Design an enzyme around this catalytic site. Structure first.
Site, PDB file in Angstrom:
ATOM      1  N   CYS A  29      -7.761 -19.028  23.847  1.00  0.00           N
ATOM      2  CA  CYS A  29      -8.240 -17.658  24.024  1.00  0.00           C
ATOM      3  C   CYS A  29      -7.373 -16.670  23.253  1.00  0.00           C
ATOM      4  O   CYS A  29      -7.888 -15.688  22.700  1.00  0.00           O
ATOM      5  CB  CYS A  29      -8.306 -17.282  25.512  1.00  0.00           C
ATOM      6  SG  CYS A  29      -6.771 -17.407  26.372  1.00  0.00           S
ATOM      7  N   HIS A  89      -5.815 -14.469  30.308  1.00  0.00           N
ATOM      8  CA  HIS A  89      -6.985 -14.696  29.461  1.00  0.00           C
ATOM      9  C   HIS A  89      -7.274 -13.424  28.668  1.00  0.00           C
ATOM     10  O   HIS A  89      -6.853 -12.329  29.041  1.00  0.00           O
ATOM     11  CB  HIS A  89      -8.201 -15.131  30.308  1.00  0.00           C
ATOM     12  CG  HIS A  89      -9.415 -15.491  29.504  1.00  0.00           C
ATOM     13  ND1 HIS A  89      -9.527 -16.680  28.818  1.00  0.00           N
ATOM     14  CD2 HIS A  89     -10.585 -14.834  29.313  1.00  0.00           C
ATOM     15  CE1 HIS A  89     -10.699 -16.730  28.212  1.00  0.00           C
ATOM     16  NE2 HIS A  89     -11.362 -15.623  28.498  1.00  0.00           N
ATOM     17  N   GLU A 105     -15.212 -14.580  23.373  1.00  0.00           N
ATOM     18  CA  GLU A 105     -13.989 -15.176  23.899  1.00  0.00           C
ATOM     19  C   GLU A 105     -13.947 -16.673  23.627  1.00  0.00           C
ATOM     20  O   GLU A 105     -14.975 -17.318  23.388  1.00  0.00           O
ATOM     21  CB  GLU A 105     -13.855 -14.932  25.399  1.00  0.00           C
ATOM     22  CG  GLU A 105     -14.924 -15.647  26.232  1.00  0.00           C
ATOM     23  CD  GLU A 105     -14.951 -15.101  27.632  1.00  0.00           C
ATOM     24  OE1 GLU A 105     -13.910 -15.274  28.303  1.00  0.00           O
ATOM     25  OE2 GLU A 105     -15.963 -14.464  28.042  1.00  0.00           O
TER      26      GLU A 105
END
Ligand SMILES: [Ca+2]
Lengths: 250, 69
Positions: A29, A89, A105
């Site tokens: 990520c 994240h 993402e």
């Protein structure tokens, strides 16, 4: 600095692609967000750390960090950060409202390592994002990065093995992740070497294009070492391009 | 087609990475938190038995499919 429109085109041009400047194996990520922020800041901001660490970087006046408050609307181009998990994240916002937002993402599902998960557009009903990093976009499109002296081929020497090489006197400081230095030649097929530890640094005297990488050449304890330092797109001339750095130069 | 056995040399649970020393006595292999097979782990402890595959990438040899003991 680049425009909101270029961020939009960048985000969509990368929908469905694996973004791997390297660092950590696979499509993580943080790889996507690092590549994105690098791009839209015309190379000025290279984020270090895990996903959660992204709000700690030096944005050089090119972006604002916002906390996610129940009134806060993310906008196209914002970077959404989740701070309250172990490593966090991070996502490239496409569009937002107060009930949810949508983003590009990587590794939302955990497939980045194995490669079956690529950069994907998903929807999130504020399920853990704590901050939003908003770029200070420029009003016009920019090609500063693309024309930068770092992405200009210039003049290189070449040995019989096809390694392009130049002399260059500077210092390289390793970034967040370690990098394995190769003994004697800038070749990923050279198995000997040692792990250059994060935040370590060395003076260097030679730069090379070999094996799809830019390398620095330097000397350490009687041995000549070659350290890969960023990706090279394999091309010479006007098609030459190199990737975001794996450390800091000076 | 075996998997290598090895030892978690050290692991930095704050940063999410460390190193494993293979049994075959070769290069220290980089281990990243994303390479540990899920199941509520995401952290390894110093000096524990692990079996894993080795991947050679641009940054060096990395541990894949890392399993406890
Ligand atoms: Ca990666």
């Amino acid at each position: 600095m680049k425009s909101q429109q270029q961020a939009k085109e960048w985000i969509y041009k990368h929908e469905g692609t694996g973004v791997d400047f390297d660092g950590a194996y696979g499509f993580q990520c943080m790889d996507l967000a690092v590549a994105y922020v690098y791009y839209i800041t015309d190379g000025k901001v290279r984020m270090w750390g895990n996903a959660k660490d992204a709000i700690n970087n030096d944005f050089k006046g090119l972006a604002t960090v916002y906390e996610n408050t129940p009134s806060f609307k993310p906008q196209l181009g914002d970077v959404a950060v989740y701070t309250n998990s172990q490593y966090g994240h991070i996502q490239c916002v496409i569009s937002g409202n107060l009930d949810y937002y949508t983003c590009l993402e990587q590794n939302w599902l955990g497939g980045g390592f194995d490669g079956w998960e690529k950069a994907t557009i998903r929807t999130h009903y504020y399920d853990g994002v704590t901050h939003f990093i908003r770029p200070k976009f420029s009003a016009s499109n920019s090609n500063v990065l693309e024309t930068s002296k770092v992405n200009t081929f210039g003049n290189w020497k070449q040995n019989q093995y096809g390694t392009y090489y130049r002399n260059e006197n500077a210092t390289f400081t390793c970034g967040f992740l370690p990098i394995f230095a190769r003994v004697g030649s800038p070749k990923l097929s050279e198995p000997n070497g040692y792990w250059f530890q994060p935040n370590g640094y060395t003076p260097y005297d030679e730069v090379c294009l070999s094996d799809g990488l830019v390398w620095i050449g330097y000397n350490w304890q009687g041995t000549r070492y070659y350290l890969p330092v960023r990706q090279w797109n394999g091309k010479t001339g006007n098609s030459y391009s190199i990737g975001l750095p794996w450390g800091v130069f000076s | 087609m075996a998997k290598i056995k090895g030892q978690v040399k050290w692991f930095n649970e704050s940063k999410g990475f460390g190193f494993i020393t293979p049994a075959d006595g070769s290069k220290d292999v980089f281990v990243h938190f994303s390479a540990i097979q899920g199941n509520g782990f995401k952290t390894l402890a110093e000096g524990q038995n692990v079996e894993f595959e080795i991947q050679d990438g641009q940054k060096g040899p990395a541990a894949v499919n890392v399993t406890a003991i």
